[PDB]
Write a protein that binds this ligand. Sequence first.
Ligand SMILES: O=C(Nc1nncn1C1CC1)[C@@H]1COc2ccc(Cl)cc21
Ligand SMILES: O=C(Nc1nncn1C1CC1)[C@@H]1COc2ccc(Cl)cc21
Lengths: 304, 304
Amino acid sequence: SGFRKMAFPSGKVEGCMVQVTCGTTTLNGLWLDDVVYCPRHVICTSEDMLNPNYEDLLIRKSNHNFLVQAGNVQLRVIGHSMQNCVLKLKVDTANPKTPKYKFVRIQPGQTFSVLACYNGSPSGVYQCAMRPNFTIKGSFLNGSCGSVGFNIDYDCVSFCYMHHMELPTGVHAGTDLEGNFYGPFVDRQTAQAAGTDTTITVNVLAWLYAAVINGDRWFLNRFTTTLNDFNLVAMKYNYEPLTQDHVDILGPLSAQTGIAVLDMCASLKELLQNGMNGRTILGSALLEDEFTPFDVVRQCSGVT
Amino acid sequence: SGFRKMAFPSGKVEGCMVQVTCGTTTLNGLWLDDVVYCPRHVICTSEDMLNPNYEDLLIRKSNHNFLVQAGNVQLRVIGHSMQNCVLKLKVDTANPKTPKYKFVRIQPGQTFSVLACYNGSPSGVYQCAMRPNFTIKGSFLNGSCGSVGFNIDYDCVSFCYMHHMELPTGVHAGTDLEGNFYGPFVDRQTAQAAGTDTTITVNVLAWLYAAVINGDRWFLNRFTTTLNDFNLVAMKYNYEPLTQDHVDILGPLSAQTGIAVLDMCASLKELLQNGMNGRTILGSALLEDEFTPFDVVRQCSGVT
Ligand SMILES: O=C(Nc1nncn1C1CC1)[C@@H]1COc2ccc(Cl)cc21
Ligand SMILES: O=C(Nc1nncn1C1CC1)[C@@H]1COc2ccc(Cl)cc21
């Protein structure tokens, strides 16, 4: 037993990290097969970031201006192209360490592991959630751009995120592996506000089920509620409205614990209206929303 | 910016995980060079765990009774020995994926990454702290035994922990890589209580410095304190007494932020005596103690 904010083993993704330099700008690239994927702002100087014309900027760049280093060996660039906000640098060698992989665009509320990188080298790994306002609350310094978010299903790595920027607010914005930003953000040094961030209700519910499984039951009450009544409370507290789809996904956890989803919603409701009163749940003094019901089932069953 | 409970990249340790089976018991092993290290309780049946005589039990086992599988290939055992609570299975092949490594016994309050494993396969990675009472608050199911804790210094992996058991309390106990348990625990299915767990004061202080660096400054006050006055408060709140050694380690953070260590102690003091009043620090509603001052400096500078 025990419940932790666990990230996937990062080994398969370490093997794909490269360093991409263009001019005086260095960031991370993702090497899969004979292609290196990196944020297109690698072609800009901080001066260009005010309002870059990426099409015009890329036109003054040749395959030889993109320096791609895999550890200590240089990769030969034989093609370059821009797909949305990412650059695809065709190299002459397929990465020997390319795992089975998919490029997926995740939905808000879903979770993933980020392998933070600097100069193509990994520094750490942590578990994130794509916020409902399409930002992530990461840990990213200068040069962390190009670091990827991913999930793993036995041997296949589903790359879902590539890091691009930190908003003036301190939250992080980025793209899927086709270069489409999650949210309204554009890769420009301009003030961009993220929308109202809501709490991922289904994830909090899943984490409440994980708490019951792990012995923390103090918050369980003698009450129940309806989806409509719960959603009136969730609205007031800027929680995502719970749907029958969310209840359906909570099914395995409801079955494992023997606690009906609406019963757990009534515990959540009392916790929202009354607070924790100085108590903790799974070592936390606030309601955790970065575990999906799939993460809870997975961690509580030891899927490798 | 942004502050996360970050684990080290787990790739170098994934390459060392093997599955060790003895009789009907399966757990994880750590393959470095021509040696596989695993908990000695792999030789026991749950019946034997009541009061095992490991010396007597091991004597009925031959090199051929220890099944060591690395992924899908079988390792040939040519020697077996017991060092304290670990078994060292000499195999005929040196692990091709052995990284530069050290076996280190960490001090309470220090942090490390755990690569949770089942049947020799990795399921996840998370950052832990060795508690002052020598337990860890992990996430470990049946078969997770043999999973290791470690730190990384550029290319060298310092293995510091091997998982052995879950105490009746739900907290975790284990050994260093020489088989010596951290704490008073013995590898036996007997009621073993961990001592009073205290809060790692120097780590909370370091995390308060990380909060200031990342923009969360609400908790900073117009007050100061002395080491003696602070320690009277820390005692009442079951915090570890702060020494001049702890203040010395906090030096880089004090210098980076411009906030004297004793000034930060006075903010901690007011937070202990008054609470957070519904506010958060680095997205947390409680005082975090699982980041050492080295982790804060490291994450805030992007060491790879
Ligand atoms: O934010 C950026 N890098 C970044 N991402 N996480 C952390 N950081 C560094 C702390 C700043 C760069 C700098 O200014 C811009 C503007 C637009 C783009 Cl597309 C990218 C950047
Ligand atoms: O606790 C143990 N495994 C374990 N460690 N983390 C999680 N778990 C499983 C949930 C139980 C085994 C079972 O009983 C004992 C008694 C003594 C030893 Cl040395 C080892 C064990």
